[model samples]
Target: GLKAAQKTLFPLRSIDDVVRLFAAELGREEPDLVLLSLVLGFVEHFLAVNRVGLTYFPVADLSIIAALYARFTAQIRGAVDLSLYPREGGVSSRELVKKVSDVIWNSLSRSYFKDRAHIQSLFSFITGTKLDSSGVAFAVVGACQALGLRDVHLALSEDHAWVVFGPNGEQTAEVTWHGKGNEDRRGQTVNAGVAERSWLYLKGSYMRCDRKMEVAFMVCAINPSIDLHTDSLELLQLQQKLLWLLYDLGHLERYPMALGNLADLEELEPTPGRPDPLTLYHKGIASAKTYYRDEHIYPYMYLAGYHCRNRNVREALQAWADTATVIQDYNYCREDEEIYKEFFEVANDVIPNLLKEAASLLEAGSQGSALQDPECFAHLLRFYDGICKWEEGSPTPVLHVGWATFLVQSLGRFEGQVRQKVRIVSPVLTFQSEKMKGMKELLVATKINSSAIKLQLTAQSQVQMKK
Candidate 1:
């Protein structure tokens, strides 16, 4: 009731005014989520442009926030036939979500700059035939809302968007696509990808977003880039202001990526009165750890990249090592190539350069040195070990012999004293066919996958290493 009593002026003027409306709506018992999206659409597309007359805050005509609202709702009504689709059973069904996703996905232009800014809005879809991957998923969730299916909400991973419905928030549908040459898999459940353990899925670490958090997604998607070198200062200011509002409202707690986005803005131009960029980065990392089971990787990457840029050698090493640890439980797959390349760079370029710097510093008798610290060597080993564990039963190999050469060459640089001080620790599991009890079914199946033609990587490999 407290939030419900709040008021916002219609025909939005300032971004602050618009975000105020967003804050009011988000705090409500029944948030009109689409209304906020359409207002955002209006503000982003028209609010602060270079146009002379109407575009420059054309009083009544511009705040046609109402018109876009009606336009979007009417479009959804005709296509999804919301009248017949009663909010029965207290949740949205499979076919219903598929229908909404299809309507949005099919209406898009065959080829456009899908990664372009200003596309993640109902205004984009309400006015044009272009919708980015994030926009398509947002539209689906928005359409479901128009149909009175509040149970259907947006589910977000690091790099992609989808919908999660049902009372348990268990049922999911692919509402958007990923990178190049990727087929849009609308309506299909995400189980197959998660089953394969694609790093894309992040082992079910994604958030089943609430209304305010989804709005946070919309706010973060407020891109300020107008070109390579220049940014729309108005857009950046709006984004910065809205992000702070969301942060104050406690909406960024579980949304780690949004926190990072805010931190990026903060770092670009520090806000007068708000948490600093580094503080926001740590908060985001903490959010990932607490809510996402530390499965999401980018939060750690944000912290690591910040450390790397400032040349915090030991801190950066620990960060990258921790990044690798997040990936160890995941299996490598084709869809995972995005994260794969990221890990590839960290492993190949960043780690090597960092080690070289660390070693060189120790040689020069600098104030800070990691080459002499055994834990530094341990972090390096852990980093490689996490990656090696990821490849155990994965369909694609993460590191080929090419990676091996580099690793050996790097490991060679670390002297015996430092390397020897590091203890290789893992609980040993001894297997003796003679002493083991019978599990013939399992034994036969395990044997089925093995071939005598190939030598196993076990005791012999360790023996050779020791020798």
Candidate 2:
């Protein structure tokens, strides 16, 4: 079945040719993951280099394509030995995972992307020693195919991934090392919590993937980013078209972030007769609640991000409130820096920007319930409330001096009555502990501290506001 796509590599004249190649493979019953992902990656790096002032073709040549396939397959055959762990008519086993995970994890020279393509590719094993977190995880699945392990699948959490196996799918093992200051995770089989899904240990929603869902997550990594100012429109259309190909096949349904991915691209450049960005954002949120057990955070962030960008201040506030509710349970972890950085931007950047816009709108004699309203102050507190709750019982402290400095100082933007109208929930923020004592903790822990006091001490500074 893979030979249908494999034996057929076009001259790859234009981006359209590559799209057909990708679509041709994906349209089959069992889409060959590596074939598409590998060729796609080559075309990707090929285009990436084409960005500068070099005379280059945007498409991948067969020479580069065949050789990539040859080396990747050879490496798998070389590493995945069945000597001691002997395949006994089985799928995934403890020792079996070691060989595959070892080759993928140990071989990587450094952690590295998003400035380029990632998530789905054997680009590392084919080329060099860097595959980012998702890159390593996906290739482990790639190994499952290459090494004749048919029954293995990916076990995903909010932050990281590992593979699951056996009849009951109870057995799990680590292939990818999460965050910093850790090693030997390659061959060892460990359970979740401390290692795999750092923050997901506490009510974090995990996504289990079949081949299609694996394909979907891989598709999520296809970065259309060519440069800061200009873009390769060829690659952009292919990325969106491939996303639609998967979405139409119903792969993006349970995958909330993928839905958000579609919404992001759609919002960036809307196609002819598709659901508008707002509808897509709502669908993204709906997918999270429908399948992710209300434990998802990013979907709401996407929706709220849309609202904030549009200066739909009240809508942004409400979406943020919903986002906080989602993140209420998870404890922060070092590996969750992406969300922390994300939340920091919302709290310190987006929230402020919204309020300033709200202030401007109010000056325009508009009746929009924005900066001048009491609910605005409530939204601000609730947003901070979510952050404070995330830090609670977390080994990694969430908020820092930069966070509190902005929050307390922002009260100046609101009317005195607006600040006074909303009552602060007492239990929401309580940053206690000797080592954890910092600017945010001091401001939050101090019983006598008032808004006026905070205003005097001033200074300053998304996925839906995270844990």
Candidate 3:
């Protein structure tokens, strides 16, 4: 049976060739007697003629091959048992054909096209379809061009690229990642009712659109679901800095889109009431500590400034204190002088500026909502006191200058007011004030001493040193 069938279809060249020869044979032979043999020969011939060994073929060709298989089965369905074909090693002829169909569909679904030739040859190697291997930009472009979809194009950003298909006006289709399988597989619908379909190709590393002219702006920019305003403080800080960096890089349009994406950051919804900012900041800080601790110090610095601007004295101080610790322990790349210099200013300048703001806020009696909870206020006082101690004890000259300046000027404005307003006292607080008083006097003395020493040096320097 095998030899006869193989002999019958040995010289087939195309789908048309097999179709015509099989049509003649089916008419001549008893349909049942020849059914299994015909199906086997057709499959073999299809494999032989279309086999593409580990290479991409046209996606359209794959569609044609699937159609041919469907046509063959449609003509023979219900006319024969279709099960008489041999089950060599438990794999029946029907199973073999089904497996081949799966391979073809799977490969085609995962394949992407750049040019017409690539789209054509992508799945050409569809033997019984035993295969092993595997952008929206090209597919969206290619599919639009090939299918004559009007006004479609490759949309781009600094970090990603995708396709935009629209017929007219505001109605548009977004084809993202890879164009594959079903409508849902490609990407989200920008305008509802637009056809949602993709070839559903497998993801690859090479799908990039770096060379495309950086479009001025998006006709349809999809915001990633992230809202910086309500998101964790750290994520807000992270995204804000990223926005600045994008702005710096001349991606003017992306900066705003990045901001929109920030607005899209999701907040926990459903079964809730108004959320507390302090609670959110605490939870956010904890999360940032656990997951992104190393990458989060710079964000904390910004958070401190934000807290200060909002008159969140305790939160601002806590953010600044946290920033200081992360800065000390930060594992940084030594070669990156830009980050180093930026972070250096954050430590030496930003932290002190935030401390000055916090001191002024406390002096102004502007605790706002934070003063309502006694425990919260107490915690704030404790954290602030701890930071003053740390700054005072630090060996770094900058740290010493920062603490002394805050104590004499910023905190000095609040000295008696703290005890009068909060009705609190501690030996540590009293002793700190004494030390701060001495430090203040010492600053003036140091200035006067330096002036005297400089005058002496100036007179001596007129007599040049002998070699």
Candidate 4:
């Protein structure tokens, strides 16, 4: 029969309450015997499936929260079964309920907790004597808390056991279980306690990663088995994708961890050796690091030159020239011609001048004093700002001179607008195209003039652009 509605939400407050609830439905509440029996079977089925759950002592209350969780999960499991076989016949509602319950319990419980030995023992103990709903529910709830499924706690007086992941690394939930039913159940109950476990079998975190790869990848290292499912082929692929994405973003923190995880794949003992995901990851990191080091160094040389001015004027100019050379190499580094064009027109061209001016300011004793001046800082800021704007506003490649000329004009316009007066600016920069485009045969055959054709021009444009 269905058990009587519970008294306090937490039934394990006392030994008496535990005993009363255990037999409440079986002894007095027989009106809905079928429903209660079905529910019991459902609980049994899921407990088997989950391989872990809670159970209460004969005299103590299970945590109300844990009980609620069990109830909700049981209902969901039941619902999933009912939906699966809406019109099927032959199996009695009771038998159907049992299978449904088992499937639900097995899936969710295993998925939720990392350990199962305590859960298995508790089940064997309770089912041995056939307790009522409350008794069974109590056992399941007690087991849940022990295993850390939910943190619903119990009093110190009551016996409790949680399922612990075994040496294999599964997590166990712990809760106490007192003797119940006949001698068989009592013996079974007494055997419950600490069991080492592994969380890998549960896989809650892997599902979480599927929802959001970036956030998942961030925490994958702390508990690699938790956030990414180790079982599915698709999920493994997703992990690879996340690793590549992190590499492209220049986020190095996860790269090492990702590489390590990939290396572990080889030891999985699967045939074909798990497609060396580490190789691709290593390549991405190598390329990204190379790009970053070159870019970071290119800008610093000019700053160094400016700081060490009189002692290294020649060196400073060389540093500035080196940055320019690096900027030109940006095109070779990028695979896409369009991206290269955009870099040359925008970021690549502007950085050289910006570094040059910064160096010149340092040479003129403006290292700290004049450098901090609002007007000077504003100009410096403007130069970089134009570069930033170029990077942001244009995804398409623009010509190198076009971007430089635009920056100069914009700076002049800004100076006039800010000062509200006209001033003759010193044009320290000499922009020159060293060679005109040659009339290649194919270009001429296409009726395109040397300048009009979208040819790969080799002419070098150099400038020490400054005011």
Residue 121 lDDT in candidate 2 = 69
lDDT of 1 by residue, 308-380 (tens): 8878876777888788788888899887778888988887788788777777777888754676666766666
- Candidate 1 vs candidate 4: the TM-score winner is 1
Score every model by TM-score.
0.82, 0.82, 0.27, 0.19
Query: Candidate 1, residue 221: CA error in Å?
Result: 1.4
Off by over 4 Å in 3: 1-284, 292-295, 331-333, 336-467
Query: Candidate 3, residues 166-226: lDDT per residue as tens digits?
Result: 3332222334432223233234433222111100110111112111112212101211212
| Runs of candidate 2 exceeding 4 Å displacement | 1-5, 51-57, 61-64, 110-120, 182-184, 188-204, 399-402, 419-467
Worst 10 residues of 2 by lDDT: 455-464
* Cα lDDT of model 2 by residue, 21-84, tens digit: 7667667665667776786676666665345543545556666767777787777778777675
- Comparison by lDDT, 1 against 3, better one: 1
lDDT of 3 at 426: 39
TM-score of 3: 0.27
Residue 369 C-alpha lDDT in model 2? 60
For residue 230, model 1's alpha carbon misses the true position, in angstroms, by 3.0
Residue 388 in candidate 2, Cα distance off native in Å:
2.6
Task: Report how far off residue 169 is in candidate 1 (Å).
Answer: 2.9
The candidate that achieves the highest lDDT relative to the unseen native structure: 1
Better of 1 and 3 by TM-score: 1
